[PDB]
Backbone:
């Protein structure tokens, strides 16, 4: 029994079976936090992850800070970009935007409040800040566009 | 402009564009709760849903009561079956099971506590109740099996 974690073979009282592979239980641990995996685990090909780290790594990224947002965290969004509460802020003045605040979504994800928009376009889609929502962990979503 | 909601055509000041179709804003509403849809909407083919109802309808079902569990709700699970807190109960005595409780998972989803198991097999995989978790809205998951 070769343990796919640490190529020593496996003598232990109890043997783990996962990903059709054989593990010491010390070795079937999260690739990223090295916490031992029980009952189920998540895998990206070759490597195994605990749930937290799988979503941090492979989950929807904050467009501002680029860190993984788990399905658990409430977020702000602009079009198909998603942002942490603390990251949905004007990139020029750094003010945290709020529901009903007028801003512009730039072509690179950048958020610019209305008052700084002349400034940023010298260096844009206008929008009104929507209320936060539970982040939908990447759910194929359809736009609702408006025409007058 | 034929509104795909209510086949009257569309005269309104403002017109909605969604699913490459044209809507009165009164008519681009949730198929199930008839609440008006804004910014994004979710669709199962032909019909459109608000987020709640999409997950209630197309989300992971409680194995006991068969109702849709949104990614937001904490659940109990046995193998690849998921259960509401209030539905992870013995099917014979109706007692709500708790972390560390010994039970059997039957071949039909049915949960039977250890004390009633001789009884239920006359009419089974033994298991120990795991702590509740945030429900993973149907995430492809790998089993960790044990061999002595
Ligand atoms: Zn090992
Ligand atoms: Zn981890
Ligand atoms: Zn962020
Ligand atoms: Zn600003
Ligand atoms: Zn209509
Ligand atoms: Zn609805
Ligand atoms: Zn239920
Ligand atoms: Zn019972």
Residues:
């Amino acid at each position: 029994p070769m343990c796919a974690g640490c190529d020593q073979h496996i003598l232990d009282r109890f043997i783990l079976k996962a990903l059709d592979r054989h593990w010491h239980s010390k070795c079937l641990k999260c690739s990223d936090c090295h916490v031992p995996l029980a009952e189920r685990c998540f895998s990206r090909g070759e490597s195994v992850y605990c749930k937290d780290d799988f979503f941090k790594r492979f989950g929807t990224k904050c467009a501002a800070c680029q860190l993984g947002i788990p399905p658990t965290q409430v977020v702000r969004r602009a079009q198909d970009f998603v942002y942490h509460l603390h990251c949905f802020a004007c990139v020029v003045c750094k003010r945290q935007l709020a529901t009903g605040d007028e801003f512009y979504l730039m072509e690179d994800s950048r958020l610019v409040c209305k008052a700084d928009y002349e400034t940023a376009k010298q260096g844009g889609t206008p929008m009104v800040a929507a209320s936060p929502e539970r982040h939908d962990g990447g759910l194929q979503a359809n736009p609702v566009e408006v025409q007058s």
